[PDB]
Protein backbone atom coordinates (compact mmCIF):
# COMPACT_ATOMS: atom_id res chain seq x y z
CA UNK A 1 0.00 0.00 0.00
CA UNK A 2 1.04 3.78 0.13
CA UNK A 3 1.11 4.15 4.11
CA UNK A 4 3.65 7.18 4.72
CA UNK A 5 5.30 8.57 7.64
CA UNK A 6 8.50 10.56 9.11
CA UNK A 7 10.43 7.24 10.11
CA UNK A 8 13.38 5.67 8.33
CA UNK A 9 11.94 3.79 5.32
CA UNK A 10 8.44 5.30 5.64
CA UNK A 11 10.00 9.02 5.88
CA UNK A 12 9.98 11.91 3.12
CA UNK A 13 13.17 10.42 1.36
CA UNK A 14 11.45 7.54 0.21
CA UNK A 15 7.98 9.28 -0.52
CA UNK A 16 8.51 9.24 -4.22
CA UNK A 17 8.42 5.67 -4.14
CA UNK A 18 4.37 6.04 -3.66
CA UNK A 19 3.93 9.06 -4.87
CA UNK A 20 6.14 10.21 -7.96
CA UNK A 21 5.19 14.12 -7.99
CA UNK A 22 7.34 14.30 -4.55
CA UNK A 23 10.35 14.73 -7.09
CA UNK A 24 7.96 17.45 -8.91
CA UNK A 25 9.20 20.86 -10.27
CA UNK A 26 7.01 22.63 -7.54
CA UNK A 27 7.86 21.23 -4.36
CA UNK A 28 7.59 22.23 -0.77
CA UNK A 29 8.85 23.32 1.63
CA UNK A 30 11.90 25.48 0.56
CA UNK A 31 15.09 27.41 2.26
CA UNK A 32 14.16 31.42 1.92
CA UNK A 33 17.38 33.25 0.97
CA UNK A 34 16.71 36.69 1.97
CA UNK A 35 18.87 37.86 0.16
CA UNK A 36 17.62 36.95 -3.26
CA UNK A 37 13.97 37.38 -2.35
CA UNK A 38 12.94 40.39 -3.53
CA UNK A 39 10.02 42.62 -2.78
CA UNK A 40 7.34 42.71 -4.92
CA UNK A 41 5.51 46.39 -4.60
CA UNK A 42 2.25 44.72 -6.94
CA UNK A 43 1.55 42.54 -3.77
CA UNK A 44 -2.00 44.09 -2.20
CA UNK A 45 -2.16 44.15 1.40
CA UNK A 46 -3.16 40.87 3.30
CA UNK A 47 -6.31 40.56 4.87
CA UNK A 48 -7.18 37.74 7.03
CA UNK A 49 -11.32 37.88 8.29
CA UNK A 50 -11.48 35.30 11.24
CA UNK A 51 -14.29 36.93 13.59
CA UNK A 52 -16.45 34.53 12.76
CA UNK A 53 -14.38 31.15 12.17
CA UNK A 54 -16.20 28.23 14.13
CA UNK A 55 -13.54 25.50 15.07
CA UNK A 56 -15.55 22.21 15.03
CA UNK A 57 -13.15 19.28 16.22
CA UNK A 58 -9.07 18.40 16.84
CA UNK A 59 -7.83 15.17 15.82
CA UNK A 60 -5.10 13.29 15.86
CA UNK A 61 -4.18 11.75 12.46
CA UNK A 62 -0.94 9.73 12.79
CA UNK A 63 1.08 12.72 11.64
CA UNK A 64 0.23 15.44 13.09
CA UNK A 65 -3.08 17.21 15.28
CA UNK A 66 -5.51 19.00 12.97
CA UNK A 67 -8.05 21.70 14.18
CA UNK A 68 -10.64 21.65 11.48
CA UNK A 69 -13.30 24.72 10.67
CA UNK A 70 -16.78 25.24 9.28
CA UNK A 71 -15.87 25.92 5.49
CA UNK A 72 -19.27 25.86 4.39
CA UNK A 73 -19.37 29.89 3.75
CA UNK A 74 -17.21 32.79 3.98
CA UNK A 75 -16.39 32.87 8.05
CA UNK A 76 -12.92 32.70 7.77
CA UNK A 77 -11.20 33.86 4.81
CA UNK A 78 -7.78 35.11 3.80
CA UNK A 79 -7.74 37.63 0.71
CA UNK A 80 -5.15 39.82 -0.59
CA UNK A 81 -1.53 39.35 -0.55
CA UNK A 82 -0.51 37.33 -3.41
CA UNK A 83 -4.30 35.99 -4.18
CA UNK A 84 -6.70 36.48 -6.08
CA UNK A 85 -10.12 35.92 -4.76
CA UNK A 86 -11.55 34.21 -1.17
CA UNK A 87 -9.21 31.26 0.57
CA UNK A 88 -11.50 29.46 2.99
CA UNK A 89 -9.98 28.16 6.29
CA UNK A 90 -10.55 24.37 6.61
CA UNK A 91 -7.59 23.30 9.05
CA UNK A 92 -4.46 24.27 10.83
CA UNK A 93 -1.81 22.23 11.71
CA UNK A 94 1.51 22.03 13.37
CA UNK A 95 5.23 20.46 12.53
CA UNK A 96 7.88 20.36 15.26
CA UNK A 97 10.78 19.03 16.31
CA UNK A 98 12.67 16.18 18.88
CA UNK A 99 15.09 19.46 19.53
CA UNK A 100 14.37 23.02 19.39
CA UNK A 101 17.07 23.60 17.23
CA UNK A 102 14.66 22.00 14.58
CA UNK A 103 10.94 21.67 13.69
CA UNK A 104 10.59 23.72 10.88
CA UNK A 105 9.65 23.63 7.35
CA UNK A 106 10.36 26.25 5.97
CA UNK A 107 14.08 27.86 6.50
CA UNK A 108 15.42 31.24 6.94
CA UNK A 109 18.94 31.24 5.52
CA UNK A 110 19.09 27.98 6.43
CA UNK A 111 18.02 28.82 9.94
CA UNK A 112 15.09 26.20 11.60
CA UNK A 113 12.52 27.17 13.73
CA UNK A 114 11.58 25.08 16.73
CA UNK A 115 8.10 24.73 15.09
CA UNK A 116 5.92 25.59 11.93
CA UNK A 117 1.78 26.56 12.24
CA UNK A 118 0.17 25.59 9.09
CA UNK A 119 -3.43 27.30 8.38
CA UNK A 120 -4.56 25.81 5.51
CA UNK A 121 -7.26 27.37 2.99
CA UNK A 122 -9.10 27.02 -0.19
CA UNK A 123 -10.12 28.88 -2.97
CA UNK A 124 -13.93 29.47 -3.15
CA UNK A 125 -13.20 29.53 -6.62
CA UNK A 126 -13.21 26.20 -7.28
CA UNK A 127 -16.48 25.09 -4.88
CA UNK A 128 -15.09 22.48 -2.43
CA UNK A 129 -11.62 22.23 -0.62
CA UNK A 130 -11.58 18.81 -3.31
CA UNK A 131 -11.98 20.20 -6.30
CA UNK A 132 -9.19 23.01 -5.16
CA UNK A 133 -5.97 20.88 -4.22
CA UNK A 134 -6.00 19.67 -7.72
CA UNK A 135 -5.38 23.06 -9.00
CA UNK A 136 -2.27 25.50 -9.23
CA UNK A 137 -4.40 28.15 -7.18
CA UNK A 138 -6.27 25.65 -5.20
CA UNK A 139 -4.86 26.36 -1.63
CA UNK A 140 -2.98 29.20 0.27
CA UNK A 141 -0.88 28.25 3.29
CA UNK A 142 -0.06 30.64 5.92
CA UNK A 143 3.24 29.41 7.86
CA UNK A 144 4.33 30.97 10.91
CA UNK A 145 7.32 29.87 12.83
CA UNK A 146 7.04 29.42 16.10
CA UNK A 147 10.66 29.63 19.07
CA UNK A 148 11.16 28.98 22.40
CA UNK A 149 10.42 31.57 24.46
CA UNK A 150 7.34 33.64 26.35
CA UNK A 151 4.47 31.61 26.29
CA UNK A 152 2.06 31.68 23.66
CA UNK A 153 -1.42 32.77 25.57
CA UNK A 154 -3.68 31.79 22.32
CA UNK A 155 -2.46 28.56 21.89
CA UNK A 156 -3.03 27.40 25.35
CA UNK A 157 -6.60 25.97 24.73
CA UNK A 158 -4.88 23.77 22.08
CA UNK A 159 -2.13 22.26 24.04
CA UNK A 160 -5.08 21.92 27.05
CA UNK A 161 -7.02 19.16 25.08
CA UNK A 162 -3.64 17.19 23.30
CA UNK A 163 -4.26 14.67 25.98
CA UNK A 164 -7.32 13.77 24.87
CA UNK A 165 -5.89 13.01 21.28
CA UNK A 166 -2.80 11.32 22.31
CA UNK A 167 -2.76 8.37 19.88
CA UNK A 168 -3.33 8.32 15.58
CA UNK A 169 -7.17 7.89 15.58
CA UNK A 170 -8.65 9.97 18.58
CA UNK A 171 -10.70 13.02 18.02
CA UNK A 172 -12.55 15.49 20.21
CA UNK A 173 -15.20 18.35 19.90
CA UNK A 174 -13.00 22.06 19.95
CA UNK A 175 -15.27 24.42 19.44
CA UNK A 176 -15.00 28.41 20.09
CA UNK A 177 -11.12 28.51 18.81
CA UNK A 178 -9.72 32.32 17.63
CA UNK A 179 -6.74 31.02 15.25
CA UNK A 180 -5.94 35.36 15.49
CA UNK A 181 -4.41 34.11 18.84
CA UNK A 182 -2.13 32.13 16.95
CA UNK A 183 -0.94 35.40 14.56
CA UNK A 184 2.32 37.21 15.59
CA UNK A 185 2.35 40.66 15.34
CA UNK A 186 3.80 41.67 12.00
CA UNK A 187 2.55 39.86 9.15
CA UNK A 188 5.28 40.86 6.73
CA UNK A 189 5.74 37.77 4.64
CA UNK A 190 7.25 35.77 1.79
CA UNK A 191 5.58 34.09 -0.92
CA UNK A 192 6.23 31.64 -3.47
CA UNK A 193 3.70 29.00 -5.25
CA UNK A 194 4.70 25.36 -4.42
CA UNK A 195 3.08 21.91 -3.34
CA UNK A 196 1.58 20.02 0.13
CA UNK A 197 4.36 18.88 2.21
CA UNK A 198 2.75 16.03 3.16
CA UNK A 199 1.37 13.14 0.85
CA UNK A 200 -0.11 13.65 -1.74
CA UNK A 201 2.48 16.31 -2.67
CA UNK A 202 0.19 17.67 -4.63
CA UNK A 203 1.53 21.49 -6.15
CA UNK A 204 -1.31 23.31 -5.12
CA UNK A 205 -0.07 25.74 -2.96
CA UNK A 206 0.55 29.33 -2.79
CA UNK A 207 2.65 29.77 0.31
CA UNK A 208 2.72 32.59 2.54
CA UNK A 209 5.37 32.30 5.04
CA UNK A 210 5.72 35.02 7.96
CA UNK A 211 8.65 36.37 8.88
CA UNK A 212 7.74 37.50 12.51
CA UNK A 213 8.10 33.96 14.57
CA UNK A 214 5.77 33.60 17.35
CA UNK A 215 7.20 32.94 20.77
CA UNK A 216 5.90 29.36 22.60
CA UNK A 217 6.84 28.23 25.83
CA UNK A 218 9.04 24.98 26.32
CA UNK A 219 6.07 23.52 28.32
CA UNK A 220 3.87 23.96 25.42
CA UNK A 221 6.40 22.88 23.31
CA UNK A 222 6.78 19.54 25.51
CA UNK A 223 3.17 18.76 25.51
CA UNK A 224 3.34 18.78 21.39
CA UNK A 225 6.63 16.30 21.94
CA UNK A 226 4.32 13.91 23.99
CA UNK A 227 1.46 13.30 21.28
CA UNK A 228 2.11 9.86 19.62
CA UNK A 229 2.15 9.01 16.14
CA UNK A 230 0.91 5.49 17.00
CA UNK A 231 -2.68 4.46 17.70
CA UNK A 232 -3.49 3.04 21.08
CA UNK A 233 -1.92 0.20 22.34
CA UNK A 234 0.74 -0.25 19.55
CA UNK A 235 4.56 0.41 20.25
CA UNK A 236 5.01 4.02 21.52
CA UNK A 237 6.60 6.27 18.90
CA UNK A 238 6.53 9.96 20.17
CA UNK A 239 5.30 12.56 17.55
CA UNK A 240 8.00 14.89 16.94
CA UNK A 241 10.03 15.08 13.81
CA UNK A 242 6.80 15.45 11.47
CA UNK A 243 8.96 17.96 9.03
CA UNK A 244 9.36 17.55 5.85
CA UNK A 245 13.20 19.34 4.75
CA UNK A 246 13.80 21.76 2.10
CA UNK A 247 13.52 20.53 -1.50
CA UNK A 248 14.92 21.84 -4.65
CA UNK A 249 13.21 25.99 -5.66
CA UNK A 250 14.01 25.12 -9.14
CA UNK A 251 12.77 27.61 -11.33
CA UNK A 252 10.93 29.53 -8.62
CA UNK A 253 11.30 33.06 -7.51
CA UNK A 254 10.27 34.14 -3.31
CA UNK A 255 8.61 37.23 -3.07
CA UNK A 256 9.16 39.80 -0.26
CA UNK A 257 5.90 41.82 0.76
CA UNK A 258 8.26 44.13 2.48
CA UNK A 259 11.07 47.26 1.45
ZN1 LIG B 1 1.76 21.48 7.21
Redesign the pocket.
Known amino acids: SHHWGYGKHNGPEHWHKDFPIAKGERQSPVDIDTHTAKYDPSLKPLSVSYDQATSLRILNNGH ?1 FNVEFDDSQDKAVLKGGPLDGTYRLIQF ?3 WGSLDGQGS ?1 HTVDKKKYAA ?3 L ?1 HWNTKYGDFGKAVQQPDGLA ?1 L ?1 IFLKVGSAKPGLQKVVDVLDSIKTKGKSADFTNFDPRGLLPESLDYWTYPGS ?3 PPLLECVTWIVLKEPISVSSEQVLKFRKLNFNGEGEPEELMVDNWRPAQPLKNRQIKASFK
Do not use: S, Y
Request: no cysteine; charged share 15%.
Open positions: AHFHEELHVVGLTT
